[PDB]
Amino acid sequence: HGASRYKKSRAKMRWKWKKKRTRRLQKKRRKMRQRSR
Amino acid sequence: PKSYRNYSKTARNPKRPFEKERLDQELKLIGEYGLKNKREIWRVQYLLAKIRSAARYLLTLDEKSSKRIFQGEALLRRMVRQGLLGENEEKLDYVLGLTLPKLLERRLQTKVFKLGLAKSVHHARVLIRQRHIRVGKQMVDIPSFLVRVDSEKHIDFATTSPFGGARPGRVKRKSLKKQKEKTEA
Amino acid sequence: GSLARAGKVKNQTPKVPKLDKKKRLTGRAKKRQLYNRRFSDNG
Amino acid sequence: KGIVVEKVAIEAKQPNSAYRKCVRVQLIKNGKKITAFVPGDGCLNFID
RNA sequence: CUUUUGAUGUUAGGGUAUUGGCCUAACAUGGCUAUGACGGGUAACGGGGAAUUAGAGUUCGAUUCCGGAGAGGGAGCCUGAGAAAUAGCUACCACAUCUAAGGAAGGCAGCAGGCGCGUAAAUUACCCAAUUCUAAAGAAGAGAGGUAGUGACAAGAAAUAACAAUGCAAGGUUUGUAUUGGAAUGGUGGGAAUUUAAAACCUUCCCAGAGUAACAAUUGGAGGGCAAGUCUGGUGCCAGCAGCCGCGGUAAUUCCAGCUCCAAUAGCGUAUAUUAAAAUUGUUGCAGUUAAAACGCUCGUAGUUGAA
RNA sequence: AAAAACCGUAAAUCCUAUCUUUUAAAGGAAGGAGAAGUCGUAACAAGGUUUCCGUAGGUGAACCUGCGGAAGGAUCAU
């Protein structure tokens, strides 16, 4: 959701690494779109 | 296209259908006054609630107010004609002081058995259905009828009821008996 | 899937009629019966 | 209104343990697929 | 955003019934805009209204009537006071009819009915007797309209018993609780008066016409919300039920059944839409440290409130 | 009167571009649910290296490190 993420009581992943992996996906998706279009 | 005749409901749905105390009080009242079903008491609730709402909307108005001194006098006069509020009752709080047995006292089935005629409340009900009554000059058969204070004065049997001097009794029984008597004679 | 068991309990349940019994009362009769059964006799 | 096509069992939530007789239907109003659970224990065979 | 194709205005003119960028020529460069224009959507004809209300409100408004538009979808046109009319005409396409093959004529979104669509909607009936219209205006037409027919769209009234004895319980000679048995009336069959343009229905009367009043009222449940069963059979993680929680592996209080009982009653279930519940859209009335939530911080125009 | 032109109203056909709505598509890359599958100790205690944030790089994955922060810390304290 918004900036009130993490709050790890739920025992989930680390939001920082989640963001890192999501940004890597963003980068490769942008590379694919540039190659295609 | 559409016919120009107005039409609207009479009985409102109580909501919350399973309250033990309200249901048992309804049972007590239905036993007391011998009506046929819950819808009738619901519509009586509607009528009483509408009267009370009118009373509130008239009480909210000021003193020497034309709207109150007109609409309220009309409503109290109608209630007096109905006989709900007596001579000593004259004010708006007394108007609000209506109650379910007070309103049910005026019905035909209660009135006829209160004054006599029948032996049971439901006996009076079935007699009203079998149309042996007359309000004076007119025969009625709807138990939900409401009489007036001067209308009670001349309630009695119907003119054409067999009890009242019409065709005496069972045609089948009497005719078989007279056949038997004539053949034996 | 093993869909060849639908209605198994329905098929294996035995069969009974509803007997004769009395014609259940209607109108004001049921209400009067219930009222006299639930206020006058009990104490 | 739709047309019954095929019959496939569907499982349930983990705490429960049973099978549900669900049937897929092809609609004629739109032309889509849906899955519907048939009520009644014997009604699975009561349908063509 | 608009402005070569009139956008905004001035001057003059054509045109119309009058006025006007309505249009023509010249001249000017103007008009709208976070008080949201220009655009896009609307499973959007507008209004008095309808649903719900403590009061605020939110939602539906094709739909008795007022106004607008249309008659396949654009275009045009005569007559006529008044039509850009469609049961008037012309032309195109898409349809489609008859056709001796050469050629003709077409618009049911009028009253009925057919096809197709979809869950979804009534008779190819009667009559202008009521309203009111048209004309050369009493005597003729009027699928405007009234009546009849189908009609559990909705709404209102009310039958499916009551009463006397006995026995039972309860009680100080009162209520209900199976036996007897006769009074009473609807339902129905019929005949009539009235009724209506005719016919029907109601209304009123007269014969037949109720005891198991065989002239019978059911739908849905009985673990909790939720009123009512650890009552009795069959099944045993299966079939299943269950709006949510949930029950079912041998006593199933929850499944399939019989009894009893329950809510409603000629009515109740199923689903979707929708309102209240919602003080979970909060103007009166929400919350923001930790549950969802005060921008990183400040200046700042429009807006908003402002000493006495 | 047929017939003809003219400014004009302008039907209808096609081309061009744009917009709006559904749909195909080899493969790629996500999410969810399912079932006792496979690999690990990541997190909850000082979780066995305190945890978390912002950012850059790296690893089979949970992750790790570097820099500057926060205590929601394991300290309210010579």
From TrEMBL, chain A:
<comment type="similarity">
    <text>Belongs to the eukaryotic ribosomal protein eS32 family.</text>
</comment>
<dbReference type="InterPro" id="IPR007836">
    <property type="entry name" value="Ribosomal_eS32"/>
</dbReference>
<comment type="subunit">
    <text>Component of the large ribosomal subunit.</text>
</comment>
<protein>
    <recommendedName>
        <fullName>60S ribosomal protein L41</fullName>
    </recommendedName>
</protein>
<dbReference type="GO" id="GO:0006412">
    <property type="term" value="P:translation"/>
</dbReference>
<dbReference type="GO" id="GO:0005840">
    <property type="term" value="C:ribosome"/>
</dbReference>
<dbReference type="GO" id="GO:1990904">
    <property type="term" value="C:ribonucleoprotein complex"/>
</dbReference>
<keyword id="KW-0689">Ribosomal protein</keyword>
<feature type="region of interest" description="Disordered">
    <location>
        <begin position="1"/>
        <end position="37"/>
    </location>
</feature>
<dbReference type="Pfam" id="PF05162">
    <property type="entry name" value="Ribosomal_L41"/>
</dbReference>
<keyword id="KW-0687">Ribonucleoprotein</keyword>
<dbReference type="GO" id="GO:0003735">
    <property type="term" value="F:structural constituent of ribosome"/>
</dbReference>
From TrEMBL, chain B:
<dbReference type="InterPro" id="IPR036986">
    <property type="entry name" value="S4_RNA-bd_sf"/>
</dbReference>
<feature type="region of interest" description="Disordered">
    <location>
        <begin position="160"/>
        <end position="185"/>
    </location>
</feature>
<dbReference type="GO" id="GO:0003735">
    <property type="term" value="F:structural constituent of ribosome"/>
</dbReference>
<dbReference type="GO" id="GO:0019843">
    <property type="term" value="F:rRNA binding"/>
</dbReference>
<dbReference type="InterPro" id="IPR001912">
    <property type="entry name" value="Ribosomal_uS4_N"/>
</dbReference>
<feature type="compositionally biased region" description="Basic residues">
    <location>
        <begin position="169"/>
        <end position="180"/>
    </location>
</feature>
<dbReference type="GO" id="GO:0022627">
    <property type="term" value="C:cytosolic small ribosomal subunit"/>
</dbReference>
<dbReference type="Pfam" id="PF00163">
    <property type="entry name" value="Ribosomal_S4"/>
</dbReference>
<dbReference type="InterPro" id="IPR018079">
    <property type="entry name" value="Ribosomal_uS4_CS"/>
</dbReference>
<feature type="domain" description="RNA-binding S4">
    <location>
        <begin position="106"/>
        <end position="170"/>
    </location>
</feature>
<feature type="domain" description="Small ribosomal subunit protein uS4 N-terminal">
    <location>
        <begin position="5"/>
        <end position="105"/>
    </location>
</feature>
<dbReference type="InterPro" id="IPR005710">
    <property type="entry name" value="Ribosomal_uS4_euk/arc"/>
</dbReference>
<protein>
    <submittedName>
        <fullName>40S ribosomal protein S9, putative</fullName>
    </submittedName>
</protein>
<dbReference type="Pfam" id="PF01479">
    <property type="entry name" value="S4"/>
</dbReference>
<keyword id="KW-0687">Ribonucleoprotein</keyword>
Automatic annotation (TrEMBL), chain D:
<protein>
    <submittedName>
        <fullName>40S ribosomal protein S23, putative</fullName>
    </submittedName>
</protein>
<comment type="similarity">
    <text>Belongs to the universal ribosomal protein uS12 family.</text>
</comment>
